[PDB]
Amino acid sequence: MYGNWGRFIRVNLSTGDIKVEEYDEELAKKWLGSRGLAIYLLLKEMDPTVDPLSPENKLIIAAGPLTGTSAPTGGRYNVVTKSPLTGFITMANSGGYFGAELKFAGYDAIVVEGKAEKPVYIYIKDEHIEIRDASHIWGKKVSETEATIRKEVGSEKVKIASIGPAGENLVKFAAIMNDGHRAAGRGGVGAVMGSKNLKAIAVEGSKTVPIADKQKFMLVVREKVNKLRNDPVAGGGLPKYGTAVLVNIINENGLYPVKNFQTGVYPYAYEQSGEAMAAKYLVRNKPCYACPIGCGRVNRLPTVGETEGPEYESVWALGANLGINDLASIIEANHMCDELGLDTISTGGTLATAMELYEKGHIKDEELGDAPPFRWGNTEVLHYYIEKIAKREGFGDKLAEGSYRLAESYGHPELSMTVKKLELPAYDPRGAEGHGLGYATNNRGGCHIKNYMISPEILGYPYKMDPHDVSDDKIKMLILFQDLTALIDSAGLCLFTTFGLGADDYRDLLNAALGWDFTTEDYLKIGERIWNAERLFNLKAGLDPARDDTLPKRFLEEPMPEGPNKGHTVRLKEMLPRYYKLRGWTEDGKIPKEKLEELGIAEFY
Amino acid sequence: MYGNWGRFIRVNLSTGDIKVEEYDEELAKKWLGSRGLAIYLLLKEMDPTVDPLSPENKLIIAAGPLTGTSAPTGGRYNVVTKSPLTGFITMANSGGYFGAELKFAGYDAIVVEGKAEKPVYIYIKDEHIEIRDASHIWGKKVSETEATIRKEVGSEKVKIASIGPAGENLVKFAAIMNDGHRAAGRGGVGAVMGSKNLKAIAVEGSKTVPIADKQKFMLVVREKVNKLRNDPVAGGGLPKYGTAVLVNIINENGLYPVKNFQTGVYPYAYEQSGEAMAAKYLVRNKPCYACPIGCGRVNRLPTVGETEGPEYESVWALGANLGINDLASIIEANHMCDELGLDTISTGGTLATAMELYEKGHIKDEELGDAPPFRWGNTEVLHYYIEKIAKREGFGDKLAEGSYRLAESYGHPELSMTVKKLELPAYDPRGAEGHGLGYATNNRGGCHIKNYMISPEILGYPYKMDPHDVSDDKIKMLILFQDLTALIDSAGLCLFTTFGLGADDYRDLLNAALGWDFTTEDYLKIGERIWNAERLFNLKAGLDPARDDTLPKRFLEEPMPEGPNKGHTVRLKEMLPRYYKLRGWTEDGKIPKEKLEELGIAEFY
Numbered sequence A, B: 001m002y003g004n005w006g007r008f009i010r011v012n013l014s015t016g017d018i019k020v021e022e023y024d025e026e027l028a029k030k031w032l033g034s035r036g037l038a039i040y041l042l043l044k045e046m047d048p049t050v051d052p053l054s055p056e057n058k059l060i061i062a063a064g065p066l067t068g069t070s071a072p073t074g075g076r077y078n079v080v081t082k083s084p085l086t087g088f089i090t091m092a093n094s095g096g097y098f099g100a101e102l103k104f105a106g107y108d109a110i111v112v113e114g115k116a117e118k119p120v121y122i123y124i125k126d127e128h129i130e131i132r133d134a135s136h137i138w139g140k141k142v143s144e145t146e147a148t149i150r151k152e153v154g155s156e157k158v159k160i161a162s163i164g165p166a167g168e169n170l171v172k173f174a175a176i177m178n179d180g181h182r183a184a185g186r187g188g189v190g191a192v193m194g195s196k197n198l199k200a201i202a203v204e205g206s207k208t209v210p211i212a213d214k215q216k217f218m219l220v221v222r223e224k225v226n227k228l229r230n231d232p233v234a235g236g237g238l239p240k241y242g243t244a245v246l247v248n249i250i251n252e253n254g255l256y257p258v259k260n261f262q263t264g265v266y267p268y269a270y271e272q273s274g275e276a277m278a279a280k281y282l283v284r285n286k287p288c289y290a291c292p293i294g295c296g297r298v299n300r301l302p303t304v305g306e307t308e309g310p311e312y313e314s315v316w317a318l319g320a321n322l323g324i325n326d327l328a329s330i331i332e333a334n335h336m337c338d339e340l341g342l343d344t345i346s347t348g349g350t351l352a353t354a355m356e357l358y359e360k361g362h363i364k365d366e367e368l369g370d371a372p373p374f375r376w377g378n379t380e381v382l383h384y385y386i387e388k389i390a391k392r393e394g395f396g397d398k399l400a401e402g403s404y405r406l407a408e409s410y411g412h413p414e415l416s417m418t419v420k421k422l423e424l425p426a427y428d429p430r431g432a433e434g435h436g437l438g439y440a441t442n443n444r445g446g447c448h449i450k451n452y453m454i455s456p457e458i459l460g461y462p463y464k465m466d467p468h469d470v471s472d473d474k475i476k477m478l479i480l481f482q483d484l485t486a487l488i489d490s491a492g493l494c495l496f497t498t499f500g501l502g503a504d505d506y507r508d509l510l511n512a513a514l515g516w517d518f519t520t521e522d523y524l525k526i527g528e529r530i531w532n533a534e535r536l537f538n539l540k541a542g543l544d545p546a547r548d549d550t551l552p553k554r555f556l557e558e559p560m561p562e563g564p565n566k567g568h569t570v571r572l573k574e575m576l577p578r579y580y581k582l583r584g585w586t587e588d589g590k591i592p593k594e595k596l597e598e599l600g601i602a603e604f605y
Ligand code: SF4
Pocket: A073, A095, A096, A238, A286, A287, A288, A289, A291, A292, A293, A294, A295, A296, A494, A495, A496
């Protein structure tokens, strides 16, 4: 078996016992790895109805077959668990170097169970797996945590994945950070880790991931790297301005959400664009393991010093979303989210809900006391609240619950722009209707990257589609993106490789490395199998398609007020049933046993 | 002699010559000390015509007789030199602990002449005076500079006075900082220091300042202290909220300048008040040497960490003055001014000039590039430009010349709210006319604390006067304040003792410590002598009364737009000639030979 090691660590924190389990190539041929392997283990061992914050829930950190190889961007891994925020499955992808290091230690994944009695951290150095006391690290920011551990194990090569005070305090949108600023960010994966009293995981490896045909593999690798290098996005836009290049693009297209999705055009968007960032604060770009793109940003601020990020989504969530223009305040806010272990999107989305509730008079000043008023454009909200949230201090305790619960507690859940309680990202669905269907059907909630329909609808990859086309062809593109993305996630590659590479390219790399002879059609079915397995878990976890697969009324009832998309609304009712049909599911959005048997997963009926 | 040692160091940085000089009690009985002693030395030894940044200018750091004693607040010192910004005399006062340490070392002052060939710093340890190389500290911020020097001299007890990058780069409003956040802030004193390649002065002393009658002094001090403690300002307001308590007060009186003095009422003033700061960021209060008041602020922000300040004037200059409400951004900005060695007031005033030039289309975006636009309320201006001013980078190079020179270069000096090129402070004169005369006549330029008419006109100290009373009585209060403040400055005390103490109490404190039998009138005349001396120095430097003793047209011709002072203008024209008459000066603001003779300073005629 190549690429994959066929080994994974299983740690039971309650009992303290560790065991290295193995699996066979036939399992890999079914679920590929990372995201796919994770959903299988969950489906086979965990009751989908467990309380996400109880010791029965499992946290799976998993690398993919191409993670740690020379495959361009082969350094990604996924964290999978039941979300304490949405109540459904969640896969959070992260880059950096941690993923590659796990593979170098000789493991594919780590299955964490139970709950330790006192804070601890797992130290791994090749075959040496150890559970150490973290009572002295608990309470520290990510940067401090990494520093302490590196000094303790006396090694700077050790890669670390940790939670900040937010995770420790069970903030519903706590993230798991690694390599300082890389995030397995959404779904509350950090709260799950914190509930187990697991402060961090430190790895050191020295092995070389086995590849089926090195000569052939290196041949393929150079061809793909060349394609990415010749692409204007992967070869010009991203390395030069990072993901933040999108600001001006999405704004010019009139779907850049401003003030909790009230409108889609922001007059000061340029001030927080990738181009403006590059001219004002950028030091250089930074690549994740084995990346020929280098979209990561390294900024320097006279206040917080050198820092990494923010990504587009973070610039938006903490900027225009809140009616804030100040890029410097946005960079500071991003840095604090990284240090504290908070998802930038949910944080900003939660702060936007409070601002709208405040605007509508549901949150009164007498309730805030002397804390900054939740007034649009108020930058003090960013400097003050982010820390209060991490520690559940003051109003920070209410905010730590997330947008939905916060709005619901004031009797106005309609002001919460969430889908399955996950806060929506930087693109208004009224200007890209296929992307809207994505938000409604995404297995993890109102999320954009597990089905990035902005590529076809706005960017022109694979090719340009009308953002207002709601035909079967548009629905089919969605299904394709969902399955393909499931493949890419499982492979261990970065989604951005789609700016140059296509399904066949991924087949070439996977075959050369694994030594398989699958057609592109075979790999895509693994993706469809993964998408369906996640849906089933959710369905078993209690998902009601009618109530849960929707979009906030704002998008279905209020015409876009201005910009090139003025007058538009998302035609979800029309698309939804056709989507279920084309997915092979029933009218009511459920998976019939016939489909399960077809995908070879009827054992989970 | 008592209080004063009667000794001072004279250092010629060009040759490295060091001299400890002495003076008799007769000189001390005429000039008292600190500010007074410094002006005598300059009138006596320096050509008032020298270029402020040439090595011929002299920098005088001088403590006063009560500095380093147990007198309430006895830890103040002054920096006096010819200003690069205004072209006139400047006396900058500072607290903290540096002043006392210099007295413990056994010296009253340090006179720096010439210019070092390369960066050096002066080290003093009692009798040990040494000029050391600072080529490696040069370029570092105040905190780093101090940490480095303490590691080098191997003593954590050394107190340091230094300049930051702003001083090194000759920014016209660069300040001299001591004890990290204490400032000898206005007039460009830091630029003079930097023009001499002098990075810092580190002192360490172990002596005790000699008091005339120790037991008598102890009892006098007890009485004075008890007066301060029972006063509502000195005993409640200051320690609790710092100088920032003034925000709400000045704002409700309608003379809190907003947007470069366009109006006097700011709607979000509360968010940046001492009360809000106490509730949001305040950790604790901190007193200077021998101070029973403790008005110093110690704050903590998630971004920059723990810091000290801001004072009222700083909160204003970087807040309402620029149309900014964010107290967090303001504290950050204050922090960077302290670190970089920039006067907060001239920094805020210069930025405000820029914002009005920008608003009126004189500064165009084409000129800024990707740098933050000077739009009112843009917090990015605080985050981005401050460091640029200090490093003289990009537009920062133009901003480094100050408000007047900047406005002048665009052909619009009238947009510059300056008097003798010194940026105006946090009080609109249209709401305090006597204070206006203060701005017009203050020897160092448009400044408020060398003649704080806000005490009688708004606060009721010595007693409440009407802010629109422009009679001779109002004019007499100003002169009294000008002379008394010259006394207090010379004594080595803090001006805040005036919230409880009066002229007689200073006479008591001064007589018990020095061994004199002076009357209150004798002391007040020393203050008058110092005031005329400074005026005389300015006349010799080129002061033109008719032209220099005024206020910007805005205050003379534009009525306060709104608030409690609506419709008011400063009736300067009719107060000015009466002030000269009361001063014993000529109709054209010159000092006749007879007055100089009356004061005993005719030798300088
Ligand atoms: S394209 Fe960006 S996010 Fe992806 S692997 Fe490269 S540096 Fe990382």
